[PDB]
Amino acid sequence: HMCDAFVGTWKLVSSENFDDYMKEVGVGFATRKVAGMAKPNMIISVNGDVITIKSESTFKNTEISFILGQEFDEVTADDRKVKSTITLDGGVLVHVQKWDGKSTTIKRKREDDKLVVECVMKGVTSTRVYERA
Ligand SMILES: Cc1ccc2c(c1)c1c(n2Cc2ccccc2)[C@H](CC(=O)O)CCC1
């Protein structure tokens, strides 16, 4: 029943500062424009200890499956090859991506009827808000 409150199908309803976040990550102009337009659906499911997060959009479809605390390979929508670890900290999913000596942290939390995604690259934070589909 870990992560029950995250399970479901979610649709993006707002984004703030995501272009600046992508710039800080190192994403180039064309990918930032196209990625920034997308309105993804996020599909989260749990089967035993395995959590799956899918992102479906006009830009890219991505999928990760993982066990909390257990590092995995992830190819991000912007085609970074990262090493990811996702843990639960006080009810927040905390996702750290490492690549090329860099790091970014993505937090996913339930707040009211929303799922809030906060991503941070050094001093730059972006907030993306999802509602149930
Ligand atoms: C650098 C970079 C590029 C693409 C990126 C990200 C970082 C991050 C996301 N996406 C997917 C995405 C997929 C489609 C469109 C935009 C973004 C997720 C956004 C989310 O799930 O809303 C999680 C936070 C960090």
Q: How far is CA 37 from CA 18, 33, 133, in A?
A: 10, 6, 18
CA-proximal residue: ligand 1, atom 9 (nearest)? 77
- Among candidates 90, 60, 92, 88, which has minimal Cα distance to 74? 60
Q: Is the dihedral of CA 23, 92, 67, 69 positive or negative?
A: positive
Task: Tell whether residue 21 is among the known ligand binding residues.
Answer: no
Pick among 1.10.3720.10, 3.40.50.150, 1.10.760.10, 2.40.128.20: CATH of 8-129: 2.40.128.20
Helix axes 18-25, 29-37, angle to 10 degrees: 150
Cα separations in angstroms, 52 against 44, 79, 107:
6, 19, 15
Rounded to the nearest 5 percent, the helix, strand and coil shares of the chain are 15, 60, 25
Residue 62 belongs to what H/E stretch?
Answer: strand 61-66
Name every protein residue with a CB atom under 6 angstroms from any ligand 1 atom. Answer: 12, 22, 25, 27, 35, 38, 40, 42, 55, 57, 59-60, 76-78, 106, 117, 119, 128
91 closest CA partner among 74, 112, 107:
107
Distance CA 23, CA 36 (A): 11
CA 40 from centroid of its chain's CA atoms? 11
Strand partners, 92: 89
CA distance from start to end of the chain: 21
Q: Are 75 and 60 in contact (CB under 8 A)?
A: no
User: Where do breaks (C to N over 2.5 Å) occur in the chain, by preceding residue number?
Assistant: none
Within 10 angstroms of residue 53's Cβ, the number of other Cβ atoms is 19
Determination technique used: X-ray
- CA 102 / ligand 1 centre spacing (Å): 17
Q: Is 32 annotated as a binding residue?
A: no
Ligand 1 atom 14 nearest Cα: 35
Which one, of 97, 92, 48, 99, lies nearest residue 71 by Cα? 97
Distance CA 7, CA 61 (A): 18
- Could you tell which of 63, 119, 129 is best to mutate to test the pocket of ligand 1, judged by most ligand atoms within 8 Å of the CB? 119
